[PDB]
Design a protein. Structure first.
Length: 13
């Protein structure tokens, strides 16, 4: 989940 969330956030920003 760490990675999943990291990635999504990278995209959002």
């Amino acid at each position: 989940a760490a990675a999943a969330l990291a990635a999504a956030l990278a995209q959002a920003l």
